[PDB]
Structure 1
């Protein structure tokens, strides 16, 4: 029995009511939106910054002189030298050319396998170039020590000692191992529950690594083009070999080191196979201690987990009571806490909680102390934080006693 609306009904509904100010307000809103759009269009620039130096820095009219005189040179590698000598040059992907040197360079300068520049017209070799240093692989280095030391890692004395015996002791004091004929393990696989502190130990090692520390970004190794990830792994391991006693950290190794299956991952599997032979196989790896971490060790290919590539498998178990107390002290060193805080009770109230949950509890206690305007967080704040962080995420406890 419902009846549809007509034109007169619509008109009366939109008129029979409030019309003394509704029309004016609606028009004002529409025109305010229009004015905002007009202003945005009028400015609508946000001039994007470009690398233009200060006016005095360049102030050069000879830049045109160098542009007109100097000529761009394609970079290519001389695969072979022919004997007037002729040179076979691979212009990356363009084509293969058989060119001869320009008078500027001497024949002795150009050697087989060296990447040299060539003119865009005749392809003559004009100048040698330093061997390629990959930009992503080079940026994969640390060159900035994180500010987390071994004193910030608590409850893992045995694990930390094993990690040092793997990545630090063999580098600092090779004599203790050479005298007894002991080859120190070259790799460590830090596997444990998430938030237990593997990455913290890795950061501590990088902090006191006193060598080349390379953090392997799982994103770069997985590349869009086929064969690019294996090339990146091969470049990273070469850059590690050129240095002395390098340290490679394969964070979240389960990102690429999945179990092979029969297209599936395929390309990532090829990159994994490239890392496997680099770590172990022909052509000994050298002084490159590999550090791998993963919260899910069961998905790794058995080849990558075999004790020839990851020699020492450190298990980062949930901290025991002493470990939890030490973690609480470490994370509460800066907190303005009262002097009677029984950290033992807070440790015993977090039965199975990693270091990350302990830090969360400490931050929650601080936030509770901030809620009520108190600058000192009493033990009651810590108890409430423990309830909120662990217990939050009676009849069941009734049976127990």
Structure 2
């Protein structure tokens, strides 16, 4: 357990009004940053052998990496070369006959194959990029409304790590695995990007299409790797966004290609709740269509809390507006209620386009102050792709 390799977030500078309080706080972050660079650089310069040097001479360069398969004697193991062959190499003294485990990736001498070192942390480049290093920059205060949905997603991924006493003092096991579903543009991924900017646990991410490799076993083996790293790195959250790509309803497909995707779902379906129960690895799926996921992948036990994200309500839509018109410069005549009240199913991604557009309709008239007409026009210009589709005047 290497511990949570949490993201690296620089502190936050607020005020945002671009006031001197802002400059000073950025300077303070810069000052320590300049200071911190000083120590790193001044540590190599200020900083100005006969035991390891002998070891590196026995190893030589380069050093192959094959898979250990059997420890025949204490000083002999069979190592399979990187091509799938086998070899009855010799186990030298410097290697630790403890870390040497069947399945471990062993460093092999190049000329005379002989175990020389055990290469832990051999996680694929395809799953070591899945780890979020630079934390996203959208804090829970950037998400407006969704207080009922946020709390549901904060009692499975944040609270169970800060106040564990509550849950274990009551007999629950903290809910682990939440399916964020709802219409497109409601905030599913933003709430996810917000748990990464608050959590202190390794936040692996996927896109539900990354874990479908072409090779027959490349697929199910990347998932078995991702949940090996998430478990390895202690507190972790695996965010499989757009889960609909891999986990759709199983069916008797007459196409081998489609029988390998399902052979990857039936791995994510067993790497979550199957024999040999999990450790501490929460999973946050997202999907705009919960009506096509397999009844098993969202069966209570793997996805315990199905957070439903409806289109914004009138009160939320008014809070959504301010979070995106916080940095804008509205004139005194910009009374947002004229646009919010409409019965148009204005999603939360629509609201940020009625903000980008109403700010660009301002440059049209050469104004950095958006008046009230700049929103009326923008609402129409931003509200297509949905036109108007409904019944005729049948119902009274």
TM range (shorter): 0.7 to 0.9
Question: Structure 1 residues 368, 175: closer, same or farther in 2, change over 3 A?
Answer: same
Per the alignment, residue 360 of structure 1 pairs with 353
CA deviation profile, 1:337-377 (whole Å, cap 9, x unmatched): 11232222210125311111111111111111111112211
Question: Structure 1 residues 169, 376: closer, same or farther in 2, change over 3 A?
Answer: same
Per the alignment, residue 62 of structure 2 pairs with 72
* Bigger relative CO (Cα 8 Å, ≥ 6 apart): 2
Per the alignment, residue 234 of structure 2 pairs with 244
Tell whether 2:244 aligns with 1:254: yes
Deviation of residue 398 (structure 1)?
12
Per the alignment, residue 175 of structure 1 pairs with 165
Deviation of residue 78 (structure 1)?
2.2
Question: Structure 1 residues 79, 330: closer, same or farther in 2, change over 3 A?
Answer: same
Per the alignment, residue 14 of structure 2 pairs with none
Tell whether 2:134 aligns with 1:141: no
Alignment of 1:1-400 (within 5 A): 70-83=60-73, 85-102=75-92, 105=94, 108=97, 111-113=100-102, 114-262=104-252, 263=255, 265-349=258-342, 351-390=344-383, 393=387
Q: Secondary structure at the match of 1:214?
A: strand
Q: Secondary structure at the match of 1:334?
A: coil
- The number of equivalent residue pairs is 333
CA deviation profile, 1:157-201 (whole Å, cap 9, x unmatched): 111111111211111111111222122210110100001110000
- CA distance in 2: counterparts of 1:158 and 1:127, whole angstroms: 52
- How does the TM-score come out when normalised to structure 1? 0.77
Question: Structure 1 residues 99, 184: closer, same or farther in 2, change over 3 A?
Answer: same
Question: Structure 1 residues 397, 119: closer, same or farther in 2, change over 3 A?
Answer: closer
Deviation of residue 120 (structure 1)?
4.1
CA RMSD of superposed structures (Å)? 2.7
Deviation of residue 298 (structure 1)?
1.6
Q: Is the 8 A contact 1:247 1:291 kept in 2?
A: yes
Per the alignment, residue 26 of structure 1 pairs with none
Structure 1 stretch 354-363 or stretch 178-187: which is displaced more? 178-187
Based on CA coordinates, which of the two structures has the bigger radius of gyration? 1
- How does the TM-score come out when normalised to structure 2? 0.78
Q: Is the 8 A contact 1:115 1:131 kept in 2?
A: no
Question: Structure 1 residues 107, 136: closer, same or farther in 2, change over 3 A?
Answer: closer
Structure 1 gap ranges (5+): 1-65
If each structure's helix is expressed as a fraction of its own residues, which one has the higher value?
A: 1
Per the alignment, residue 31 of structure 1 pairs with none
- CA distance in 2: counterparts of 1:281 and 1:107, whole angstroms: 34
